[PDB]
Amino acid sequence: MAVIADPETAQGFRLAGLEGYGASSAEEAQSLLETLVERGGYALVAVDEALLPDPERAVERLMRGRDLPVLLPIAGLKEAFQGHDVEGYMRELVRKTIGFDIKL
Amino acid sequence: VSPTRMNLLQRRGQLRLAQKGVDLLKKKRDALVAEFFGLVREAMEARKALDQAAKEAYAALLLAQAFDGPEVVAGAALGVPPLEGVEAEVENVWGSKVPRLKATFPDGALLSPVGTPAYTLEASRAFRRYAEALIRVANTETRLKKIGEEIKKTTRRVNALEQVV
Amino acid sequence: PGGDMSEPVTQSTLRIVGAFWRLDASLAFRRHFPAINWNGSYSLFTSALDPWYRENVAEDYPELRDAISELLQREAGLQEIVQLVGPDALQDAERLVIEVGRIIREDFLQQNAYHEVDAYCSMKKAYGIMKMILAFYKEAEAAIKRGVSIDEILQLPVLERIGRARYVSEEEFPAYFEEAMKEIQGAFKALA
Amino acid sequence: PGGDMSEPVTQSTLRIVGAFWRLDASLAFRRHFPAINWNGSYSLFTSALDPWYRENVAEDYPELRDAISELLQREAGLQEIVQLVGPDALQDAERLVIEVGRIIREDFLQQNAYHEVDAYCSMKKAYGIMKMILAFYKEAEAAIKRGVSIDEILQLPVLERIGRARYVSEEEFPAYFEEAMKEIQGAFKALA
Amino acid sequence: PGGDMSEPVTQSTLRIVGAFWRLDASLAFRRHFPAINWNGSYSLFTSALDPWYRENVAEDYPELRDAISELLQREAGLQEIVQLVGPDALQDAERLVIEVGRIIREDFLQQNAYHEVDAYCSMKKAYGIMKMILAFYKEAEAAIKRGVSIDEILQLPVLERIGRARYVSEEEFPAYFEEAMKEIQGAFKALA
Amino acid sequence: DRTHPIPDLTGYITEGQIQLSRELHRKGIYPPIDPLPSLSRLMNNGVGKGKTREDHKQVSDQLYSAYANGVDIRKLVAIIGEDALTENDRRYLQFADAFERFFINQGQQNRSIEESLQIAWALLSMLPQGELKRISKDHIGKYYGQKLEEIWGAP
Amino acid sequence: DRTHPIPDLTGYITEGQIQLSRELHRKGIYPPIDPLPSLSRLMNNGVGKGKTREDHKQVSDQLYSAYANGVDIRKLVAIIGEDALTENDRRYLQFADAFERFFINQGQQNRSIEESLQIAWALLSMLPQGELKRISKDHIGKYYGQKLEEI
Secondary structure, three states: OEEEEOHHHHHHHHHOOOEEEEOOOHHHHHHHHHHHHHOOOOOOEEEEOOOOOOHHHHOOOOOOOOOOOOEEEEOOHHHHOOOOOHHHHHHHHHHHHHOOOOOO | OOOOHHHHHHHHHHHHHHHHHHHHHHHHHHHHHHHHHHHHHHHHHHHHHHHHHHHHHHHHHHHHHHHOOHHHHHHHHHHOOOOOOOEEEEEEEOOEEEEEEEOOOOHHHOOOOOOOOHHHHHHHHHHHHHHHHHHHHHHHHHHHHHHHHHHHHHHHHHHHHHHOO | OOOOOOOHHHHHHHOOOOEEOOEOHHHHHOOOOOOEOOOOOEEOOOOOOHHHHHHHOOOOHHHHHHHHHHHHHHHHHHHHHHHHHOHHHOOHHHHHHHHHHHHHHHHHHOOOOOOOOOOOOOHHHHHHHHHHHHHHHHHHHHHHHOOOOHHHHHOOOHHHHHHHHHHOOOOOHHHHHHHHHHHHHHHHHHHO | OOOOOOOHHHHHHHOOOOEEOOEOHHHHHOOOOOOEOOOOOEEOOHHHHHHHHHHHOOOOHHHHHHHHHHHHHHHHHOHHHHHHOOHHHOOHHHHHHHHHHHHHHHHHHOOOOOOOOOOOOOHHHHHHHHHHHHHHHHHHHHHHHHOOOHHHHOOOOHHHHHHOHHHOOOOOHHHHHHHHHHHHHHOHHHOO | OOOOOOOHHHHHHHOOOOEEOOEOHHHHHOOOOOOEOOOOOEEOOOOOOHHHHHHHOOOOHHHHHHHHHHHHHHHHHHHHHHHHHOHHHOOHHHHHHHHHHHHHHHHOOOOOOOOOOOOOOOHHHHHHHHHHHHHHHHHHHHHHHHOOOHHHHHOOOHHHHHHOHHHOOOOOHHHHHHHHHHHHHHHHHHHO | OOOOHHHHHHHHHOOOEOOEOHHHHHOOOOOOEOOOOOEOOOHHHOOOOOOOOOOHHHHHHHHHHHHHHHHHHHHHHHHHOOOOOOHHHHHHHHHHHHHHHHHHOOOOOOOOHHHHHHHHHHHHHOOOOOOOOOOOHHHHHHHOOOOOOOOOOOO | OOOOHHHHHHHOOOOOEOOEOHHHHHOOOOOOEOOOOOEOOOHHHHOOOOOOOOOHHHHHHHHHHHHHHHHHHHHHHHHHOHHHOOHHHHHHHHHHHHHHHHHHOOOOOOOOHHHHHHHHHHHHOOOOOOOOOOOOOOHHHHOOOOOOOOO
16 A cells, blocks of 8 residues: 655655655654654555664564554665565564574 | 461472463463464465566566567556555464455556567566565465464463473 | 361261262351352262163263253353453453353252252252243354343243243153254344 | 482482482483483582593593583573474574484494493593584584585584494404594595 | 561560561662561551641641652552552553552662761651652653653653762752752753 | 372371272263372283283273373363364264273173273274274284274263 | 572571572583672771772672673563564673673682772773763772773
């Protein structure tokens, strides 16, 4: 529904019918995400990884008791055409969830 | 408690019950971690699929940005109806209720603007595939988060029983 | 003296009597009477009295009381898990077992020695109450196997009739029992 | 009676004896036939016996014994995570530690009392086995740090050589020990 | 013997004395002195001395003491919860009351007999310390309601002023107390 | 209480014990002998070849392990439900129920040793072949396969 | 058992006691002296200025408080895990680990009082200045800030 990323790909998201929103800074993306969650949690929120590594961490206090507005990070267009550490992201997620490093 | 033989027998029974409960909770944690190991591989595969869809969608988008002017795609995005009413059903996972996003339709692909150049049209479908993979990734990540919370709770309870009571 | 059954007189009389009715202090504190600890009580005259029960109460009375005792044993077994994790973490079948055990305790085992009617119950009245409870349990189990959630069952109207059956007088009981059985059949048959 | 260490007899015994060899039924249940638990056992004679060991066995025997004990302790410290996620999900170094502990348990501590050769063992054979195990551990750790996969290391026939060592006759042991040390040196980095 | 308060001497003494100052081994292990268990101790003269406290110490001394005692009871009650799940899993008010309980039990109850100044404490000094602690508690509650985080409050520099209050001499204490009160009332206003 | 002086000394002198269960008695099973806490110290010297049958010890210990596992699964299914259980857990649950129904609850019957071994093999047949880690392949080939509808405790 | 009549009655007569710990012994620590149960009642007569060093008593008090904090943090970690710890709690936990590794463990070294005080100040350097409430501000800065471990 709602996407936070660079303004260039926000045009494509709007072209898809999604509520693409433009941002270019970590603090600016944090402010935009706070604005989105404050004005209603109905929209699903795709945040860009470079702008925000852990989207739920930034608005963790405001997201207390919130279930519908799920937040996840996305790589972005500049990083899309480059090698993506899918193993690193999964290892970090497993470490956060279970408190261990078990990737072997 | 009052020191008496009956109280002593009651305490010994309580100790036996605590040990049996510890064993049962450890078995439950074993089942949970098996499910977690399955979900980790599922999430990794979904993330790889999303990455591939992202690559192809961005390649499609950038191609139309140079062959056609940005004003054309801007007008097309202004003319397309927005997306609304994405299904948000709930799912039961080990008792706790987890949301499950379900993109029923990207408005059904029912409306398009009057100006539809060849390069622009393919870009929108790429973004639709992008979104329908992103929803799957989000659902899987929510499932792993719930299972991880359950595992952490069980481990905390087991530690409390083994080291306090 | 201290409530300790390890006291020598209690042990000496424990090896001689043919029936033992241990009293629970927890039930007495809760004002749940007769306050008899079902786990710690027993009787050695069960088998010898079976022909009399068959001839004078009903042909299947021993089977009914055995089923009730097995239900109580299963509830006692599940109470350990209930204390470990809480009553909400159980499945639907175990929740039903717990609820049926609670109903048995509150509506069949409990008895008011001061009430005009409840102070004395004949064998046939107890047999009818047991039959009602067992029929309700079978219906509820069948309903749960059909996907009906445990919360709807606990709200069924027939529970008030089951709870109130103990206060019906002896000569009013035969018709009330048949009405309760038909209502129990109808409530589950019509709903699902 | 009951196997409780708080009995007055056990407490009086533990205040005067020099060594305590704790047997376990659990170890015997796992076919660890000597069945002596190394976590609960202890001895107070090692420090006074070191000078004799340094002259009749070898000059660095106490160091080897201490290193083996430390490796066993490190194995025991990792037994929680291996119970949680399983051995296959560990890192390379921890998996190597677990494997070395398994090698020790199955090849050095374990002893067959009904075998015609393994029923008895001299101090020199034990020293040789400890030396071989420690050398293999050092080589494997270096290989792991270099970038060799752990599963590849698990396929080396040097493990098969080491496992058979305790069945070698006392007369023929030194030649086998020299050949096995040469093989340990010639494995790993000698063939990448 | 063994710190057992069910000793015949202790039980026979407790039937006639008007106060009971119970020493705790756990407090002495942490070097918390005088190591008086404020949960197991009591006194029967506290209600009869209120007019003297009003006439000689302050008009609202009993209310301040009761508030301090209530806060200490609340943190003692939350201790068992916090020791199982961790402070971070609690609400902001609970974290604040835990922190103020720590401040009370480390800056008011503790007293050093071998220190040159802290050895003796008058009633006015204790009243001032209690006033400072309670004023800080009220201001922290107001700030937390305004939305300030717990850690930002914890890292305030006036907590150090409160912590060193008991080491201040009797002569200089009123000026230190007034300045600390001004700092307490001015710190949160700037923090907004 | 097994720490009472009388049972304590009796165990300290005698070899093993047979333990009755109150749970089995209240569940309608007779004789209510609980196999898990029971133990015979001289059992290994009275069974084997030329004494009972050559597969006695392995059948006994396989029954012990399978019953313990089934009891554990029965405890676990109460909280996690039957969906989370694998196929093997369901097999163990069914085995435990059938074991309590047929092996223990024999009533007033006089069973020969061969009849008891036959019922034991019929009960073991419910488990998948290859789960019987404690039984050698020869005995499995010779005896595994029959069903409860030929030989069982309610004929 | 510290409640047994022999040690209990001995404690009522003597000035303090030195208590050993089985956990420290099993962790390969010598001498395995557990500082929390240990006590010395005549210590304040012998330490001070004009004897030993002036900061002796305050350093001992700060060490006791910090080690108690580390022990309770260790107790908390065994329930919820390390990853949930606050930065201050992690600092106290690693302080307790370093204390057990370096201060208690000696071997057969004949450490003098100055060396022991140097090691103690190095250990207290791991904590943030301002948490040392037991120590007067003068001794801090004069001795605070030593390198983590010279060993």
